[PDB]
Design a protein around this ligand. Sequence first.
Ligand SMILES: NC(N)=N/N=C/c1cccc(/C=N/N=C(N)N)c1
Lengths: 183, 287
Amino acid sequence: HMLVLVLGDLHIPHRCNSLPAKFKKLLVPGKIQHILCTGNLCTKESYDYLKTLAGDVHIVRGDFDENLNYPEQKVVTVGQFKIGLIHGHQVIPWGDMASLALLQRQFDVDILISGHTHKFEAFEHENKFYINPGSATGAYNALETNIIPSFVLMDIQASTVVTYVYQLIGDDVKVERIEYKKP
Amino acid sequence: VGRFIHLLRSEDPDQQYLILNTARKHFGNQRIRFTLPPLVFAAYQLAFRYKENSKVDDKWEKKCQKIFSFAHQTISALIKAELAELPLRLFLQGALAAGEIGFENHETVAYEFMSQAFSLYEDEISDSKAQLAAITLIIGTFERMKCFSEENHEPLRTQCALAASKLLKKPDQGRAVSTCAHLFWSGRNTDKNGEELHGGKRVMECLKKALKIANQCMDPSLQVQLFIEILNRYIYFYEKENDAVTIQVLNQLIQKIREDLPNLESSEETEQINKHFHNTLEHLRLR
Ligand SMILES: NC(N)=N/N=C/c1cccc(/C=N/N=C(N)N)c1
């Protein structure tokens, strides 16, 4: 019913030159409706690319974004779900589930999307859902040596969201399915 | 652009180094904002490559030293070009990388990188928003690092706390001093064999200071918001099994918030502060 692309930590041109060819092939205009982006693009160029894929694009500010136009954080409502969005360099310790949970309480969200770690995550904790799309370009990160290019597609239908994680392993795109229902 | 360098991946790290150096030498002062940072990240990437070759390359430590010199010097060129925000961040990333790679004198290099960051912080970061952003990044980076002995960890720790306490705006101070709590808890040093400091009493001093600071805010909406944020910080350490966080402290703060919350002006902003508190209570009751 409702398709939402979730991606970020591109880090072009700082750490990477572009998205993998296989991801670009999968990401075609007119298919996705909403984009939620965790930031670190890190230039207008990448914003312009995202604007090709959909009309509704929401971006939050990464630590290396040049465009300080972007908000630190955003709350977007899609259907029955209240969805929070933040890059995650402000969440300390970085990637800590408990610190993420503090923010869910503050933002009052069913789902919290964050980045920064360059590692895909999708899990439920105290009946709330947490998503990290990872880095779409598989960008370098000091704290993790095996970075896999990843992004997420949320299929939002009524009180259920099916999240598909797309991961580039070798020259092969692998897909996983995670389901979350509102309490 | 400089994204060209990302397309060049020699299988041999020694060839990568040459490639990197010829690229840097190839690169006016306007262009380098976009042209030099990729080189810095490529350098960090190469250092990890040398570590991964530690069993096979007799000279890997020396090459790592060279790479960090190159990065230091490349970042310095950006400073000269009248940039502050990006060089600060590049220095932090350099400290991170050096921290993670156990080459000879990595600690000294990590410390130099952190110092450079602090220097740019003190001298060139002018706006309250930029300062709060930069200090949060400094704290967040340092909290992940495990390479420093106590003799080096403590000055950085107290420097973070000092910088936090000296932000202009009392809300900012409150948040920043509160965030430093994580350095005393989940920060690590070599002394403790890479285990977390779990300095539970010092965590309490931080949160106490943040409360004292939130008490000095005259905006009532802002004061209560900070109170609820700090409560949540107290809850975080409670569940992490900090024995210094007592139920008396939790309940007193809960009670203060209940006292002050009805006083607020009715608004959307007030509704969100109420929901934040309600969500906090629900978490404690229902888990
Ligand atoms: N380094 C980058 N990307 N941008 N600006 C650097 C710079 C140079 C001189 C002063 C400042 C301080 N800026 N303060 C704000 N609020 N932009 C910042």
